[PDB]
Each structure stands twice: as structure tokens, then as C-alpha cells.
Design a protein around this ligand. Structure first.
Ligand SMILES: Nc1ncnc2c1ncn2[C@@H]1O[C@H](COP(=O)(O)OP(=O)(O)OP(=O)(O)O)[C@@H](O)[C@H]1O
Ligand SMILES: Nc1ncnc2c1ncn2[C@@H]1O[C@H](COP(=O)(O)OP(=O)(O)OP(=O)(O)O)[C@@H](O)[C@H]1O
Ligand SMILES: Nc1ncnc2c1ncn2[C@@H]1O[C@H](COP(=O)(O)OP(=O)(O)OP(=O)(O)O)[C@@H](O)[C@H]1O
Ligand SMILES: Nc1ncnc2c1ncn2[C@@H]1O[C@H](COP(=O)(O)OP(=O)(O)OP(=O)(O)O)[C@@H](O)[C@H]1O
Lengths: 537, 37, 40, 213, 107
């Protein structure tokens, strides 16, 4: 006999697994090298084969698809599939009999024909329902322990059986019995991670090819655009997106308020447009998990307007700092402080500076999540964030509204002390070797921080000014453009007399409040407001 | 005071014998017919 | 558990064997009593 | 002999539109085009929201809608039982007929509908529960295994309800299991008018209602 | 042969009047008219108040006057049991006869 171990009519393309391919190459190299090679060389070498494969990873990836495909790829006895904990039975000693029934046939075949038999595949799905720790599973009955012991004794006992392949997949590997996770049993273990950009492109092509073939897909569709937009989608979500888009297109030809009807004409004219894809992205499907999903639209609701010189100066300084921290050896840690009068946009400029930087790891720590936290929880949250930041090669973090992060209030003073000591030490310590860290701080009250003796721990400070000249006020108004030229001249005629001191966050409020009155009283009302509230140096 | 608990349960079977009552009745039966005849 | 199911069915078949034997015993006893009454 | 006007549900135009677009659309189009497209149907629907807005009314009326076998219903935890390996027996018993008819007829099989009620009683995050002799655990792994499977089904539909949508296991909600999640809320004015109109048609029919209402 | 004089409850005129108007009124008017109106029947009552006001007495009296089967009583936490899943079977039991007669006789 010259039985082959691979189906001659096989191709890696038809398997359709997408971005795993390096994982699949590793699996093949380890699991089947011993069998592909011709007999005499291995006979001389006398190398045993591996028996147990363990696949693990988060929900919705290849794993079941991959196991179904591996089972299909070989040309041998059909696999026997076990769907989770269907082994358990209500009589004493009925579980072990069931388990051994699986391997009985392989034992017999090996014993009869010797070393020239075929291959048998046993696929354990949801293996964590069975092989939980015998030292941890509930003490109410033996059966879980005796099942584990039966499996361990049978997979690699005193009698040597070396013609069986057992495949396992799970979600929480660390619970599995370590005596099962040792060479010669379940030995190769691999992580099926979330797909990268290229993998997304592959998956999309695989699911779109058939529709392409018949010219149902409209030519405007740009797959690469879709790939770029879709961040953290898994394979399952990537399929569901396409399904939802097709459904949105197909529904267009059905009536269903009165008794259902379908147009036998337009049934011939169906196509999917890119607009359906856009629509499905926001209404129907949402990606779970993922890292980022930042709502910068909530931190920077109005973008920026370059109402004068200082905005550019500030942004230039921030860019310089980023560039420096990018390429340096002596000083792997850099810390910058932003401060100025209240209502001056201190947060928006910080967030924009961060976003222009293109570091892989960008996170903002803010008190708005921490409402009612004790003096302990805050420490935990901060420690967690910085631990995360230390993993990635490059990381930039923003700590905003320090004064509210301390619970400061002027009557005592009163503040939390633990938080301040944690903040000082976390600012001081250097990151792990070869990584680099940037920290951007925001505060309203410089002098207080100076008093607490933490101003020194920052490397440098940046001053964010507010509007100082009436000319700048006029320019900011023009950039907003909420008033007509005649109103502009009317304002100018009086405003030019004296300088003004007002922060832009208050400017917007005043404008909005002024718009509410009748047209003939707007200007005057505005003026009155600017007069009454603007009294300040 | 610790919480209060609940159990699963497991059952087993028994065999029984078959033949003695008929070994007896058969050794009994086949002679009263002769007597009556 | 189909094979285990049939194993259970075999056990119940043994139980019904016991039942059948008891039945035919009961019939034998009735025939005893009938013949014994008849001879008089 | 069906239309939307008879089921007597009001204020939920948009929700029912979405459900129809995403659930039964693929099954009504003449199949040939779907074969060219080669898409597989959706097999999950989740309805959640505060007490008293019509979740069960929807599930009942949908069940009456489809030209299909009688639905199999589970009134909360009817599955738990004393003996080791009995809950799993029940849950495997639910699906059996759909598998058998798939095996015999393939694509010609009818549609079998299963309606869970109070799904969050039995399915929770694996490990949130602790010390309950694990009987609550193997139920979830049996259900997760059986819906997606290594072997496949393409002719079932599972409808679930709860008043607490957060505690359900995350693994049970990704696309391909329970996909279409809708939120049923308190109505706006127009919906209130519709409800009042529906609940008085009978009385208005016989003139039992005074003209001053 | 019921008569309010036989009840033996005093100082509870209004409460009992309201309970009667809400719960049993729709069962005494002729069935034909209730058919035209299409209203389902109320299926619940809750009584709460400080100790020694006469709740249980009222419940018992309502139970007697109804020409129906003997009421089933649950004496607080009677139903609990120590085997997993037997606790709810005691609940499922109570309604089984009402479901059975609903299927056999309907309205
Ligand atoms: N890398 C991938 N390439 C192509 N399709 C994929 C990929 N990953 C997942 N899919 C598709 O998404 C679905 C994944 O189902 P599958 O059962 O493999 O997920 P799983 O996470 O292994 O299952 P489980 O939830 O039990 O862990 C299938 O429709 C499959 O075709
Ligand atoms: N040039 C600008 N710079 C910054 N913000 C601007 C500018 N023009 C308009 N805005 C808008 O003004 C808002 C000002 O509010 P914001 O909370 O950002 O300011 P802040 O100075 O950080 O606040 P606070 O005084 O509460 O610390 C910004 O969020 C942005 O929406
Ligand atoms: N939109 C509606 N249209 C018509 N009747 C309604 C509507 N919403 C509620 N009702 C009436 O109120 C009842 C609400 O019962 P239903 O089972 O729908 O509530 P639910 O919110 O699912 O309940 P639960 O929160 O207890 O599970 C319906 O049977 C009907 O009597
Ligand atoms: N309105 C009443 N008329 C006559 N007797 C009354 C009245 N209210 C209470 N009683 C007497 O009080 C006795 C005990 O009352 P009952 O059992 O109703 O207590 P309760 O107030 O409901 O309290 P509990 O919460 O302890 O059950 C009744 O048997 C009856 O003798």
C-alpha cells in the first residue's frame, strides 16, 4: 500500500481562511512534515509524530472554520465530532465508557494492521467544558475528575498509539489541566488574533468575489476604502456587514404593508451601491472590543479657528516636542505643562496637539469617568492606564484638569494626599528599556501647583493666552461670521475705544445668548454683555 | 455566616434473578397430569 | 448514547424476562389447582 | 390572508420595518438570485427594554405570521433538573427535528421557530456565577456549541427576550448567533393615539361609546 | 346564599367596595354584553398595611364567597427545596390544573 496523506484535488485558495496564512504555514510545517516526506528517510531518522493541537482566541475568528477545513483537507476516515459536554451521563461509570468508545476503533486498527493504517480525526469542541482543573471543579461528584483521568490515561497511556490526531479549541486556555498541556499530548498551541488591514482586504475580496462574477456589484465600490474605515472588525462582523448591505439593497423591491408583493421586473435589475455600505456602517453594525474609538468629536466640538498669532506658536511648540521625543537616546521621558486663565481652550489645543502626533498609543485620562470614586479607586485607574502605556513602543498620555483630579477646594485647603504622591512618582519614573513616553498636563491654577512643589517635576511649561486686542475680536467674529457688515462697523465704532479681556469659551456663550433677542436689540444687548462681564485686566 | 448550598445527584441500577421459581414449578407440574390421567 | 440506550433496553429486556417467567409460573399454578380439584 | 393591519400593534412602525428588512427579506425573494449571491440567512433576534412595551406581543404575532410549524416555547428555566447530564439532554432535544429535516430534505426543509423567554435566567457570563456546582455552566457551552456548530443548520430562528440586556454572555451576541438587537421603548404622542384607537375599535363598532369622548 | 351581613368585617366599606367593583364586577354582568366589549379580566390583588388591621380575614372571606374550587395556599417560603431545579417545579405545579381546564373548556 502507498496511501497518500493529502487530497490530490486541493488548493490553498479554496480554503478561504484569509489572514491566518502564516499561522497555517506554521501548523502545516509542524503537524505534517513527518508524514509528507517519503518513508525511507523518516524510517532512518525514526521521528515520532505530534498528536494534539490546541487552538485558542477571542470570539469570532477562524477557529471553527479552520478546524472544518483541516478535517476536509485530509483523505482518511471521516472525523468524529464531539459537540461540547454531551459525554456526561446519569449512571455511575457511564462517562468513561463513552470516552473510550471513541478511541476503541483506532486502537483496534493500529493493533491489526500495524504501522500501515490510515488516520483518524477526533475533534473536541469547547474543550473547557470537560478538562477543567481536577483541583478546582466542584466537590459534589467525582465524574469530572474520573473523566479527566480517563482522557489522560487513554490519549498517551502504557500502550503506544501514534496514528491519531486530536484537535481542540477553546476560549479560556489557562484553566485546562496542565498534565494535558505537555509534549506528546496537546502540545502546539496558537493564538488566532484580530485581522490586520491586509487580512481585512482578503476577507472582503473572498466574500465579494461571487457577487463580482455575475456583475451584481456596482463598479464604484472601493474595497480599500472600506478596509481603511473598518477598524477592529473581526471576520464575523466583516461578513455580517456585507450581508446587511445586500439586504438593504434587496429590500428595495418588496412591498409589505398590505399583502406582500415583489416586482418580477426589478428583481432582474438588482445591484448594490456604496451608499448602502455607508449606511450599514452606522445604523446596523457596530464593532465591539477594539482599541481607540475615541470620541474626539466630544473633546473638540468646534475644531479650531486661528484668531491670532498665539495659536500657531503653541501648535509649533507642541510639534517640536513631539519630534524631539521621537528620536532620542539620552532622555527617553519628556513632560510638558499647559496652563492659562480659565475658559481659554486649554483642553482643545492639548487634544489637537496629541491627535496631530501619530503615535500608536494615544490615551486621555480624565476625571469625568471618575464620579464618586474613593481615594483608592483613582490610584488603581491611573496605575492601570500607565501600565497599558508602558507596553507599546511609543506612547503619549494626556492628564487634564489636575485641580479637579485632586479634589482641591480653597476653604481648608483640602485635598487627597495619596493621589498627589502617586502622580509625583509616576511622573518621575522612566519607562521600560527602549520605550519612550510623553505626558501632557493641563491646569488652571499655576500658583497652587507651585505651592505643592510639583511644578519642578515637569520639564517645561507653555502659556495659552486669551483675546487681548479689539482687532482680534473683530477677526474672530468674521471667522464665525454671525453678524453683518453694518453691525460689524457699529460694534467697531465703540469697541475700538478700549482693549478687551475675554476668553473664547465665553465669547461663544455671549454670542448665542445675544442671538435670542429681536433684531433691533441684538447689537445693544451684545455690547451691554461685553461691558458688564469683561471687567478684568 | 457563610451562604447555604445545593446539590446534584447520581443514580445506579440493580440486577435481580429469574430462574428459580420455574425450576421449581416445572419440577412440580409434569406428574399430577399423569396421576389424573 | 444510542448504544448505551440499547444496553439499558437489554436490561429492561432481562426484567421482562423475569416478568414472563413469573407469569408462566402463575399459569402453571392455576393448572395445578384445576387438575387437583378435578380428580376428586 | 395576512396584513399588518390585523395584528393590532401600534407605534412600532420603524422597529417592525427593520426586523422585516433584516430577517425575512432574504427568504421571500425568488431564490435563484440569492443562489447567485450565495448568502446564508440570519438566525437570531434579541428584543429588550423596560417593563410593559410589547416584546412578547411582537414575538407571539411573528410566530403566528410565518407559514411554519408550531413554535417550541420555554417558559423560563424549564430545563434545569436534578441528575448529572439532564439539562444538556433537554437542550439537545430542542434542535433534533430541525437537524433531521435538514438531513433528509436539505434546502427544501421548512422553517422551525424556537422562542426563548427570560433568556437571562439561564445564560449569563461564564464565571460571574461561582460555587453553584457548575450546573449553570454546561448549559451555556452546550447552547453555544449547538447553535453555530461544526455541523451546520440553515433553517432555524431563535427569538430571545430580557429586561436586563447587559448580563448576557458576550459570546452569545456576536453576528451569526443573535444578530438583530432592537430596543422597544415608551411611545411618543402619535403612538399613544394609535394605541388608544386600537383598544376601542370594538366599542366604537356597536356605539357603546358616547359621542363626547 | 351569600350575604354581606355574614362577612363579619367592620370598618372596611370603601376598600371592599373598590375591590368588588374592579375584580368581580366584570364576571356578574351578562356574558353576551361582555363579549361585545372585549375586555380581559383582572388577575391580581395586593394588600399591605400595619399589623392587626384585618388583611388575612378579608382574604379568607373573599375565598369563601366564591363558588369555585378550594383555594391553594402557600404558607410563605414553603416551596423552597435543596436540589437544583426542584424549587421552580413547585411553582410550575400550581397552575397546571388551570391550564388543563382552559384547554378543555375554554371560556
Ligand atoms: N479569518 C477569516 N477569514 C474569513 N472568514 C472568516 C474569518 N474569521 C471568521 N470568518 C467567518 O466568520 C465566521 C466565523 O465563525 P467561526 O465559528 O469560525 O468563529 P469562531 O470564533 O471560531 O467560533 P466561536 O464563537 O465558537 O469561537 C464564519 O462565517 C467564517 O467564515
Ligand atoms: N481656537 C480655539 N481653541 C480652542 N477651543 C476653541 C477654539 N475655537 C473654538 N473653540 C471651542 O471652544 C471650546 C472651549 O471649551 P474647552 O473646554 O475646550 O476649554 P478650556 O479652556 O479647556 O476649558 P476650562 O476653562 O473648562 O478648563 C473648545 O472645546 C472648542 O469647542
Ligand atoms: N404597543 C402595544 N400595542 C398594543 N397593546 C399593547 C402594546 N403595549 C402593551 N400593550 C398591552 O399591554 C400588554 C403588555 O404585555 P407584554 O407581554 O407585551 O409586556 P412586556 O413588556 O413584554 O412584559 P414583561 O416586561 O413583564 O416581560 C399587551 O398584552 C397589551 O395588552
Ligand atoms: N376589621 C375587623 N373586624 C373584625 N375582626 C377583625 C378585624 N380586623 C382584625 N380582626 C381580628 O383580628 C384577627 C387577626 O387579624 P388578621 O389575621 O387579619 O391580622 P393582620 O392584621 O392581617 O396581621 P398579620 O400581618 O399579622 O397577618 C382576626 O382573626 C379578627 O379576629
Amino acid at each position: 500500500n502507498r496511501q497518500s496523506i493529502i487530497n490530490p484535488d486541493w488548493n490553498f485558495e479554496k480554503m478561504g481562511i484569509g489572514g491566518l496564512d502564516k499561522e497555517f504555514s506554521d501548523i502545516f510545517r509542524r503537524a505534517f512534515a513527518s508524514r509528507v516526506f517519503p518513508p525511507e528517510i523518516v524510517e532512518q531518522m525514526g521521528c515520532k509524530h505530534v498528536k494534539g493541537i490546541l487552538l485558542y482566541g477571542p470570539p469570532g475568528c477562524g477557529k471553527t472554520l479552520l478546524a472544518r477545513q483541516i478535517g476536509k483537507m485530509l483523505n482518511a476516515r471521516e472525523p468524529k465530532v464531539v459537540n461540547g459536554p454531551e459525554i456526561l451521563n446519569k449512571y455511575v461509570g457511564e462517562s468513561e465508557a463513552n470516552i473510550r468508545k471513541l478511541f476503541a476503533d483506532a486502537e483496534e486498527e493500529q493493533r491489526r494492521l500495524g504501522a500501515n493504517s490510515g488516520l483518524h480525526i477526533i475533534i473536541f469542541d469547547e474543550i473547557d467544558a470537560i478538562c477543567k482543573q481536577r483541583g478546582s471543579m466542584a466537590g459534589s461528584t467525582g465524574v469530572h475528575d474520573t473523566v479527566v483521568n480517563q482522557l489522560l490515561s487513554k490519549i498517551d497511556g502504557v500502550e503506544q498509539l501514534n496514528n491519531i490526531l486530536v484537535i481542540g479549541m477553546t476560549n479560556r486556555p489557562d484553566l485546562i489541566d496542565e498534565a494535558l498541556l505537555r509534549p506528546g499530548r496537546l502540545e502546539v498551541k496558537m493564538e488566532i488574533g484580530l485581522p490586520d488591514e491586509k487580512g481585512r482586504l482578503q476577507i472582503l475580496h473572498i466574500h465579494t468575489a461571487r457577487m463580482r462574477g455575475h456583475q451584481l456589484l456596482s463598479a464604484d465600490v472601493d474595497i480599500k476604502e472600506l478596509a481603511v474605515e473598518t477598524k477592529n472588525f473581526s471576520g464575523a462582523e466583516l461578513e455580517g456587514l456585507v450581508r446587511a448591505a445586500q439586504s438593504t439593497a434587496m429590500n428595495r423591491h418588496i412591498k409589505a404593508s398590505t399583502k406582500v408583493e415583489v416586482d418580477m421586473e426589478k428583481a432582474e435589475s438588482l445591484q448594490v451601491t456604496r451608499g448602502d455600505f455607508l449606511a450599514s456602517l452606522e445604523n446596523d453594525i457596530k464593532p465591539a472590543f477594539g482599541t481607540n474609538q475615541e470620541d474626539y468629536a466630544s473633546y473638540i466640538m468646534n475644531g479650531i479657528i486661528k484668531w491670532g498669532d498665539p495659536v500657531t506658536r503653541v501648535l509649533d511648540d507642541g510639534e517640536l516636542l513631539v519630534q524631539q521625543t521621537k528620536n532620542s537616546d539620552r532622555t527617553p521621558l519628556v513632560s510638558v505643562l499647559l496652563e492659562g486663565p480659565p475658559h481659554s481652550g486649554k483642553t482643545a489645543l492639548a487634544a489637537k496637539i496629541a491627535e496631530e502626533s501619530n503615535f500608536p498609543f494615544i490615551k486621555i485620562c480624565s476625571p469625568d469617568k471618575m464620579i464618586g470614586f474613593s481615594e483608592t479607586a483613582k490610584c488603581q485607574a491611573m496605575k492601570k492606564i500607565f501600565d497599558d502605556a508602558y507596553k507599546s513602543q511609543l506612547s503619549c498620555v494626556v492628564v487634564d484638569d489636575i485641580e479637579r483630579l485632586l479634589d482641591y477646594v480653597p476653604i481648608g485647603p483640602r485635598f487627597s494626599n495619596l493621589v498627589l504622591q502617586a502622580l509625583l512618582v509616576l511622573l518621575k519614573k522612566a519607562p521600560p528599556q527602549g520605550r519612550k513616553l510623553l505626558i501632557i498636563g493641563t491646569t488652571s491654577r499655576k500658583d497652587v501647583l507651585q505651592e505643592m512643589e510639583m511644578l519642578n517635576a515637569f520639564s517645561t511649561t507653555i502659556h495659552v493666552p486669551n483675546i487681548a486686542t479689539g482687532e482680534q475680536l473683530l477677526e474672530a467674529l468674521e471667522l464665525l461670521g454671525n453678524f453683518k457688515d453694518k453691525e460689524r462697523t457699529t460694534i467697531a465704532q465703540q469697541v475700538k475705544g478700549k482693549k478687551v479681556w475675554i476668553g473664547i469659551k465665553k465669547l461663544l456663550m455671549l454670542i448665542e445668548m445675544s442671538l435670542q433677542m429681536d433684531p433691533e436689540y441684538r447689537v445693544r444687548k451684545f455690547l451691554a454683555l461685553l461691558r458688564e462681564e469683561g471687567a478684568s485686566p | 455566616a457563610s451562604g447555604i448550598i445545593m446539590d446534584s445527584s447520581i443514580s445506579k441500577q440493580a440486577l435481580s434473578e429469574i430462574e428459580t421459581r420455574h425450576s421449581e414449578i416445572i419440577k412440580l407440574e409434569n406428574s399430577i397430569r399423569e396421576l389424573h390421567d | 448514547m444510542a448504544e448505551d440506550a440499547d444496553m439499558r433496553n437489554e436490561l429492561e429486556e432481562m426484567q421482562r424476562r423475569a416478568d414472563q417467567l413469573a407469569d408462566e409460573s402463575l399459569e402453571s399454578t392455576r393448572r395445578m389447582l384445576q387438575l387437583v380439584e378435578e380428580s376428586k
